[PDB]
Scaffold this active site. Structure first.
Site, PDB file in Angstrom:
ATOM      1  N   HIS A  26      -1.365  45.327  28.887  1.00  0.00           N
ATOM      2  CA  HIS A  26      -1.318  43.991  29.469  1.00  0.00           C
ATOM      3  C   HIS A  26      -2.473  43.127  28.917  1.00  0.00           C
ATOM      4  O   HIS A  26      -2.357  41.902  28.822  1.00  0.00           O
ATOM      5  CB  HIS A  26      -1.421  44.102  30.978  1.00  0.00           C
ATOM      6  CG  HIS A  26      -1.833  42.832  31.642  1.00  0.00           C
ATOM      7  ND1 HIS A  26      -0.952  41.833  31.991  1.00  0.00           N
ATOM      8  CD2 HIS A  26      -3.066  42.401  32.024  1.00  0.00           C
ATOM      9  CE1 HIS A  26      -1.657  40.848  32.568  1.00  0.00           C
ATOM     10  NE2 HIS A  26      -2.946  41.143  32.610  1.00  0.00           N
ATOM     11  N   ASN A  34       2.438  37.702  32.498  1.00  0.00           N
ATOM     12  CA  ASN A  34       1.472  37.062  31.608  1.00  0.00           C
ATOM     13  C   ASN A  34       1.078  37.911  30.432  1.00  0.00           C
ATOM     14  O   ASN A  34       0.292  38.850  30.589  1.00  0.00           O
ATOM     15  CB  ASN A  34       0.194  36.690  32.374  1.00  0.00           C
ATOM     16  CG  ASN A  34      -0.878  36.055  31.470  1.00  0.00           C
ATOM     17  OD1 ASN A  34      -0.554  35.363  30.501  1.00  0.00           O
ATOM     18  ND2 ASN A  34      -2.152  36.279  31.801  1.00  0.00           N
ATOM     19  N   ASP A  47      -8.255  38.058  38.065  1.00  0.00           N
ATOM     20  CA  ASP A  47      -7.801  38.925  39.135  1.00  0.00           C
ATOM     21  C   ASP A  47      -8.496  40.287  39.112  1.00  0.00           C
ATOM     22  O   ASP A  47      -8.169  41.164  39.923  1.00  0.00           O
ATOM     23  CB  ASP A  47      -6.262  39.067  39.175  1.00  0.00           C
ATOM     24  CG  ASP A  47      -5.644  39.377  37.846  1.00  0.00           C
ATOM     25  OD1 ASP A  47      -5.988  38.719  36.847  1.00  0.00           O
ATOM     26  OD2 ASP A  47      -4.742  40.249  37.810  1.00  0.00           O
ATOM     27  N   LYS A  68       3.620  47.650  36.293  1.00  0.00           N
ATOM     28  CA  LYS A  68       4.351  46.706  37.134  1.00  0.00           C
ATOM     29  C   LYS A  68       4.920  47.428  38.364  1.00  0.00           C
ATOM     30  O   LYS A  68       5.165  48.645  38.328  1.00  0.00           O
ATOM     31  CB  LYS A  68       5.512  46.074  36.332  1.00  0.00           C
ATOM     32  CG  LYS A  68       5.125  45.375  35.013  1.00  0.00           C
ATOM     33  CD  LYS A  68       4.422  44.044  35.263  1.00  0.00           C
ATOM     34  CE  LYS A  68       5.332  43.146  36.083  1.00  0.00           C
ATOM     35  NZ  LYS A  68       4.756  41.808  36.421  1.00  0.00           N
ATOM     36  N   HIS A  75      -9.855  44.770  33.863  1.00  0.00           N
ATOM     37  CA  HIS A  75     -10.045  44.066  32.603  1.00  0.00           C
ATOM     38  C   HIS A  75     -10.767  42.758  32.839  1.00  0.00           C
ATOM     39  O   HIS A  75     -11.306  42.539  33.917  1.00  0.00           O
ATOM     40  CB  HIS A  75      -8.734  43.909  31.797  1.00  0.00           C
ATOM     41  CG  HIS A  75      -7.622  43.256  32.549  1.00  0.00           C
ATOM     42  ND1 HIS A  75      -6.912  43.872  33.554  1.00  0.00           N
ATOM     43  CD2 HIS A  75      -7.095  42.008  32.419  1.00  0.00           C
ATOM     44  CE1 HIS A  75      -6.003  43.010  33.981  1.00  0.00           C
ATOM     45  NE2 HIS A  75      -6.083  41.864  33.320  1.00  0.00           N
ATOM     46  N   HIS A 106      -9.639  39.592  33.071  1.00  0.00           N
ATOM     47  CA  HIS A 106      -8.992  38.492  33.785  1.00  0.00           C
ATOM     48  C   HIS A 106      -9.570  38.188  35.170  1.00  0.00           C
ATOM     49  O   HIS A 106     -10.261  39.017  35.770  1.00  0.00           O
ATOM     50  CB  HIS A 106      -7.474  38.686  33.861  1.00  0.00           C
ATOM     51  CG  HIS A 106      -6.781  38.453  32.556  1.00  0.00           C
ATOM     52  ND1 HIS A 106      -5.533  38.972  32.286  1.00  0.00           N
ATOM     53  CD2 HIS A 106      -7.230  37.787  31.466  1.00  0.00           C
ATOM     54  CE1 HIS A 106      -5.254  38.609  31.052  1.00  0.00           C
ATOM     55  NE2 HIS A 106      -6.247  37.890  30.508  1.00  0.00           N
ATOM     56  N   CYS A 144      -3.074  46.120  35.984  1.00  0.00           N
ATOM     57  CA  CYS A 144      -2.091  45.231  35.416  1.00  0.00           C
ATOM     58  C   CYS A 144      -1.228  45.741  34.277  1.00  0.00           C
ATOM     59  O   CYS A 144      -0.266  45.080  33.913  1.00  0.00           O
ATOM     60  CB  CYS A 144      -2.772  43.911  35.067  1.00  0.00           C
ATOM     61  SG  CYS A 144      -3.534  43.136  36.519  1.00  0.00           S
ATOM     62  N   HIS A 172      -0.354  43.860  40.373  1.00  0.00           N
ATOM     63  CA  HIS A 172       0.341  42.928  41.273  1.00  0.00           C
ATOM     64  C   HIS A 172       1.582  43.644  41.816  1.00  0.00           C
ATOM     65  O   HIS A 172       2.256  44.382  41.091  1.00  0.00           O
ATOM     66  CB  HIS A 172       0.781  41.672  40.506  1.00  0.00           C
ATOM     67  CG  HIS A 172      -0.319  41.034  39.716  1.00  0.00           C
ATOM     68  ND1 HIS A 172      -1.226  40.140  40.246  1.00  0.00           N
ATOM     69  CD2 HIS A 172      -0.712  41.234  38.429  1.00  0.00           C
ATOM     70  CE1 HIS A 172      -2.120  39.839  39.296  1.00  0.00           C
ATOM     71  NE2 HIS A 172      -1.867  40.474  38.169  1.00  0.00           N
TER      72      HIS A 172
HETATM   73 NA    NA Z   1      -6.827  42.931  40.708  1.00  0.00          NA
HETATM   74 ZN   LIG Z   2      -4.605  40.342  33.536  1.00  0.00          ZN
HETATM   75 ZN   LIG Z   3      -3.049  40.771  36.571  1.00  0.00          ZN
END
Ligand code: NA
Ligand SMILES: [Zn+2]
Ligand SMILES: [Zn+2]
Ligand code: NA
Ligand SMILES: [Zn+2]
Ligand SMILES: [Zn+2]
Lengths: 230, 228
Positions: free
Chosen positions: B142, B173, B83, B164, B79, B81, B161, B203
């Site tokens: 997410h 987040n 990360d 989990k 996406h 973000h 993301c 993550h």
């Molecule tokens: Na990543």
């Molecule tokens: Zn994200």
């Molecule tokens: Zn993330």
């Protein structure tokens, strides 16, 4: 209208970045049959939408892009699996041109031992020609079960391909791979999705405007009635 | 698990697939590890998500070059973000080609962030010199534009993301989350990938298809703890 760039190929410029070609090639028993395609150019990088019927004519076309447009052909997108779409893909692949197509076109090409486009999409895919958007959409079956359309938003030009007939056309043509029942619905979606189309290029014959859509729909529906009653 | 550097380590999942963890600090939260994937075919590599910055991304890319003898030619972000696209700038300077959800592209454009090249809306199968990289947008979670990448020849899903790890207890987040759509997306993902051998979250530790149900429970529990 056009300009010749080969004894059999002529090209018409539609916009500063868009050209539509007419490729004439013999088809057993029908003489010289013309097929259409597009050359889109951005930052001296070119996208070829459909290839002529064979490598030889595709090579002539690409050599013109190099010699006359000073552009490198980096991108290729076919309307569907027929020859007037991927007949020259073998040469483009030997030359390293990258390809994108409806995942249905890739499965069909694989199944049939034809040159296979690389990346497949299922709904829509906007291929970025160095920042210029070439929006590919699969809206359903028509002339071919896998037929897509390629919309150029920055130009208001639609290469509808073989699901669209030219204004002089009076018959539905080759329906061996068609989905005649889905075809009128697919045209309805095309009409509704691209209302700002300035140029509309069919798979064969002269390009025109949005009227080609309604024109084609009448042909398919007349075909349906003709082969349903009595 | 091999250490690439002090802040980046990599684990091989199959002959052709690796998963990395890169540690970077989130303003106000400390060091946060983020995951990504390296898929290799005929000495060409696809990077699924980049570390948080160009520096870390370059570190990882040089290691694929020197240790894996493969050239990164392809990139797909989960996406918009950091990360996922933090190091896209460097990748683009390296000539790396990118594909992403059209939603991700539009978001990156409106935010003045590095923009992926080719955008898809439903699904897209990218060919890494013959090896298929199947990308799917199955709904918001997410992030509104989050996708998943399935490796059919490997039975490995990089869910990103929207999923989990097993140890997680919190939704994390959610500033760009679509919380009500999220569980529905996980149902779509569950129905779609029952054969997963490895499921990698954005993550945390990777696991199996159990991360999908686990996550659905976390999202639902969240919806409850905020409705009493
Ligand atoms: Na990543
Ligand atoms: Zn994200
Ligand atoms: Zn993330
Ligand atoms: Na054509
Ligand atoms: Zn055809
Ligand atoms: Zn045709």
């Amino acid at each position: 209208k056009s300009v010749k760039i080969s004894d059999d190929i002529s090209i018409t410029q539609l916009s500063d970045k868009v050209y539509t070609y007419v490729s004439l090639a013999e088809i057993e028993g029908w003489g010289m049959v013309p097929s259409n395609g597009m050359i889109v150019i951005n930052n001296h990088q070119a996208a070829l939408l459909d290839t002529p019927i064979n490598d030889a004519q595709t090579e002539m076309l690409v050599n013109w892009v190099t010699d006359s447009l000073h552009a490198k052909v980096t991108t290729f997108i076919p309307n569907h699996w027929h020859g007037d779409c991927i007949g020259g893909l073998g040469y483009l692949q030997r030359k390293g041109v990258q390809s994108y197509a409806n995942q249905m076109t890739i499965d069909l090409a694989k199944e049939k031992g034809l040159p296979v486009p690389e990346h497949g999409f299922t709904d829509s895919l906007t291929v970025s020609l160095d920042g210029m958007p070439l929006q590919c959409y699969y809206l359903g079956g028509g002339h071919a079960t896998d037929n897509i359309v390629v919309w150029l938003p920055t130009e208001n030009i639609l290469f509808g391909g073989c699901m669209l007939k030219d204004n002089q056309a009076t018959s539905i043509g080759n329906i061996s791979d068609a989905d005649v029942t889905a075809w009128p619905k697919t045209l309805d979606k095309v009409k509704a999705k691209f209302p700002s189309a300035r140029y509309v290029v069919p798979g064969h014959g002269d390009y025109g405007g949005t009227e080609l859509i309604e024109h084609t729909k009448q042909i398919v529906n007349q075909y349906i009635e003709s082969t349903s009653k009595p």
